[PDB]
Amino acid sequence: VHLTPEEKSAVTALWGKVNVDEVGGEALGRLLVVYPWTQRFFESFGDLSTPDAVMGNPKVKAHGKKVLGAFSDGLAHLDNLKGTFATLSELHCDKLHVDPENFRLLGNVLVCVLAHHFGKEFTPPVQAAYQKVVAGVANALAHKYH
Amino acid sequence: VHLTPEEKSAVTALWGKVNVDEVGGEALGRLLVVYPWTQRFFESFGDLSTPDAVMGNPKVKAHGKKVLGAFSDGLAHLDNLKGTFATLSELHCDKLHVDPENFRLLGNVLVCVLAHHFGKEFTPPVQAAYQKVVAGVANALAHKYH
Amino acid sequence: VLSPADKTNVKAAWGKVGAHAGEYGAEALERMFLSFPTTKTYFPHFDLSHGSAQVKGHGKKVADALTNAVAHVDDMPNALSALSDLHAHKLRVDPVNFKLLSHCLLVTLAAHLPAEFTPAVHASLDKFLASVSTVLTSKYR
Amino acid sequence: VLSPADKTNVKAAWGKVGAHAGEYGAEALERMFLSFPTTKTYFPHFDLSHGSAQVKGHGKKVADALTNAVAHVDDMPNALSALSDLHAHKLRVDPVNFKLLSHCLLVTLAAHLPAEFTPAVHASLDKFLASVSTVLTSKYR
Ligand code: HEM
Ligand code: HEM
Ligand code: HEM
Numbered sequence: 001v002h003l004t005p006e007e008k009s010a011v012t013a014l015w016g017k018v019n020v021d022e023v024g025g026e027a028l029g030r031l032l033v034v035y036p037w038t039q040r041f042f043e044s045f046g047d048l049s050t051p052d053a054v055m056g057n058p059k060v061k062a063h064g065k066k067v068l069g070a071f072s073d074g075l076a077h078l079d080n081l082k083g084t085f086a087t088l089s090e091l092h093c094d095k096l097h098v099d100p101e102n103f104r105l106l107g108n109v110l111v112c113v114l115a116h117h118f119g120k121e122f123t124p125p126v127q128a129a130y131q132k133v134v135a136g137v138a139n140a141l142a143h144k145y146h
Numbered sequence: 147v148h149l150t151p152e153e154k155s156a157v158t159a160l161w162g163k164v165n166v167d168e169v170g171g172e173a174l175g176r177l178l179v180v181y182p183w184t185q186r187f188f189e190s191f192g193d194l195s196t197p198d199a200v201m202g203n204p205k206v207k208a209h210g211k212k213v214l215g216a217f218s219d220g221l222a223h224l225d226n227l228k229g230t231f232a233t234l235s236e237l238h239c240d241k242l243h244v245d246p247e248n249f250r251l252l253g254n255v256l257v258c259v260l261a262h263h264f265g266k267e268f269t270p271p272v273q274a275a276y277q278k279v280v281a282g283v284a285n286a287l288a289h290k291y292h
Numbered sequence: 293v294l295s296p297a298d299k300t301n302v303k304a305a306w307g308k309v310g311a312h313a314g315e316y317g318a319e320a321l322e323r324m325f326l327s328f329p330t331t332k333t334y335f336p337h338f339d340l341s342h343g344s345a346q347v348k349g350h351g352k353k354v355a356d357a358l359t360n361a362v363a364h365v366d367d368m369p370n371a372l373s374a375l376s377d378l379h380a381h382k383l384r385v386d387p388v389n390f391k392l393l394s395h396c397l398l399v400t401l402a403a404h405l406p407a408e409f410t411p412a413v414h415a416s417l418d419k420f421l422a423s424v425s426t427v428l429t430s431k432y433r
Numbered sequence: 434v435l436s437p438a439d440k441t442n443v444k445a446a447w448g449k450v451g452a453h454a455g456e457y458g459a460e461a462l463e464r465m466f467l468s469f470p471t472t473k474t475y476f477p478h479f480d481l482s483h484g485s486a487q488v489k490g491h492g493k494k495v496a497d498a499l500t501n502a503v504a505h506v507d508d509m510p511n512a513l514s515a516l517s518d519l520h521a522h523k524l525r526v527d528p529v530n531f532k533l534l535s536h537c538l539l540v541t542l543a544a545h546l547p548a549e550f551t552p553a554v555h556a557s558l559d560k561f562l563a564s565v566s567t568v569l570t571s572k573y574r
């Protein structure tokens with residue numbers, strides 16, 4: 001159900017080139033632009049009135065750094081995603097009330113951002129590896145919902 | 147993931163009342179009526195031109211009996227659905243070329259057929275148990291796809 | 293698109309529902325919360341226990357919207373326009389959830405319509421609830 | 434619905450594809466087959482290996498259909514009428530797979546059009562491919 005050894009190597013190698021703060025702000029910004037209903041959690045974040053305003057919003061960027069920072073840390077535990085994200089799963093269900101579909105939308109946006117950032121280096125096999133990863137993280141974050 | 151003991155008990159209790167042959171014919175027939183693109187897998191089955199023709203088709207009734215028979219057998223192994231359906235999973239992928247989304251559509255039609263047949267007895271808790279079962283069977287049948 | 297036969301089947305089935313529409317709406321919500329617990333993330337302010345008056349009152353509103361949709365089945369985008377606004381820009385329910393409630397509405401109708409829920413009527417109701425769902429998400433972006 | 438700004442964004446971004454239509458269509462399909470292997474159940478009759486003539490030819494037909502849709506954004510149901518007949522009545526691809534190919538077309542465009550794939554254009558392209566998919570599944574039942 002998992003990544004092959006070569007797919008794990010490919011994920012790790014590409015991720016070593018990622019500016020996590022930059023990619024995180026970009027992915028969260030794009031999530032709020034492309035799927036604007038995801039803004040429902042961020043009414044306290046200020047100006048989200050235009051795409052430029054969302055992308056430039058420092059509270060959006062700050063949350064993107066925090067979310068993708070935890071994503072990035074989880075890539076060290078590709079064989080224990082459910083365990084690694086269990087307590088964040090309970091938190092997103094019990095306190096934050098985040099529909100897990102948001103995790104899957106963010107995973108899709110992240111793949112698009114990696115494709116945009118890395119261009120031809122984001123080959124079809126590398127994408128396939130990252131699709132397994134973002135699906136696994138989303139499934140892990142959703143696993144303690146009740 | 148995973149049924150609770152009260153859900154397993156609810157599943158087993160309802161299934162003791164199910165005429166697998168008749169429910170299987172009804173579920174497969176309704177699949178082909180409600181989602182008629184699924185008829186693409188039954189080109190040799192004869193007349194599927196109207197709802198009455200689909201529901202009365204002996205080849206539809208016979209196949210529904212075989213499909214829900216294998217479903218029924220899997221209900222004895224609710225903790226090991228992946229292993230129970232591995233052989234049919236490979237069959238449906240390698241030989242039959244059946245998109246696993248069809249298993250999810252059949253699952254939802256089966257839930258509707260149980261509600262229609264049993265009425266008030268198909269309570270929201272009983273449905274929830276069956277939803278976990280049909281999702282689990284669909285995931286198990288999808289698991290050997292490649 | 294809903295065919296003339298679909299519209300006829302929907303009107304017949306929802307007509308048999310009659311005055312029970314609100315009760316069936318609440319039941320469908322209860323079925324949804326138990327079958328698909330992620331849908332509960334939109335109702336942190338509700339007591340979702342069985343028999344909850346908040347679920348019953350929400351169920352009546354959902355059912356009345358569907359009655360109004362049936363009454364305007366050829367003019368549904370305008371009939372539902374205020375609800376499309378509300379879901380797109382305030383509630384912001386992810387579109388994947390409308391399929392879950394639609395399924396639970398179908399299940400509720402099947403459990404209450406032994407004679408009427410034929411394969412053909414089942415198909416028409418599924419198309420109708422998908423069409424309602426499409427209208428309700430039409431202004432999301 | 435596609436706003437006028439959506440239409441402007443799509444025409445500009447897709448105009449940049451130009452002669453790369455077949456190439457990007459084939460790459461999108463390969464991305465889909467590798468990322469989403471269940472989609473291969475619709476192509477058991479193809480050589481799916483990298484660079485295959487069948488995938489290249491099909492990639493071009495998909496891409497030219499998208500060019501037709503972009504060129505006729507104001508009336509895609511009529512422009513794609515034969516193609517919606519074909520998928521509804523013959524190919525009968527389950528509607529869930531249109532989201533998978535659409536995602537892989539978006540990734541392909543992101544990987545090839547760095548200057549053009551802005552957040553607003555990303556949104557517009559996503560809406561456009563969803564609208565194409567809606568048209569292509571509109572006659573399924
Ligand atoms: C890879 C996926 C995600 C990861 C790893 C992640 C991780 C985190 C972490 C580490 C926190 C801080 C928790 C704390 O302070 O104890 C957090 C908070 C939060 N997350 Fe998630 N998140 C993800 C996706 C999302 C998405 C898609 C949304 C909504 C669209 C979301 C909504 C929130 C909200 C609203 C908070 C509270 C932030 C605050 O209080 O300032 N998360 N998340
Ligand atoms: C719970 C879900 C399902 C189960 C347990 C199941 C099981 C089976 C079984 C036992 C067979 C007999 C094969 C043999 O004896 O070698 C079969 C054949 C087949 N199944 Fe499935 N099935 C399921 C769902 C589906 C669905 C949803 C479809 C398509 C919509 C499908 C398409 C087929 C086809 C085309 C065949 C071959 C029929 C023929 O001989 O012409 N199955 N399946
Ligand atoms: C057939 C589909 C649906 C219909 C006809 C519908 C209709 C309605 C109506 C009539 C209201 C009350 C509006 C008002 O009081 O002004 C409402 C509110 C609401 N709906 Fe929807 N809805 C549908 C689907 C959904 C789904 C799938 C969800 C989430 C899983 C959802 C979540 C909500 C919430 C949270 C509220 C606010 C309830 C409250 O706070 O009182 N709806 N909807």
Ligand code: HEM
Pocket residue numbers: 472475476491494495498499516519520524526530531532534535565566569
């Ligand atoms: C943006 C979405 C899509 C577009 C624009 C599109 C367009 C087309 C076109 C132009 C053709 C060839 C028509 C002809 O030669 O007369 C075709 C055929 C076909 N399509 Fe679709 N399609 C789409 C989605 C899909 C999806 C998602 C699948 C399956 C995962 C699919 C499966 C097929 C198959 C199997 C064929 C037959 C290929 C052959 O045997 O040559 N299509 N499509």
Ligand SMILES: *Cc1ccc(CON(O)O)o1
Pocket residue numbers: 293294419423528570571572573574
């Ligand atoms: C009225 C209408 C829109 C789409 C359809 C066919 O249902 N398929 O699931 O797409 O009917």
Ligand SMILES: *Cc1ccc(CON(O)O)o1
Pocket residue numbers: 387429430431432433434435560564
């Ligand atoms: C044109 C159109 C149809 C639906 C939408 C909103 O996108 N969401 O998926 O609903 O726009």
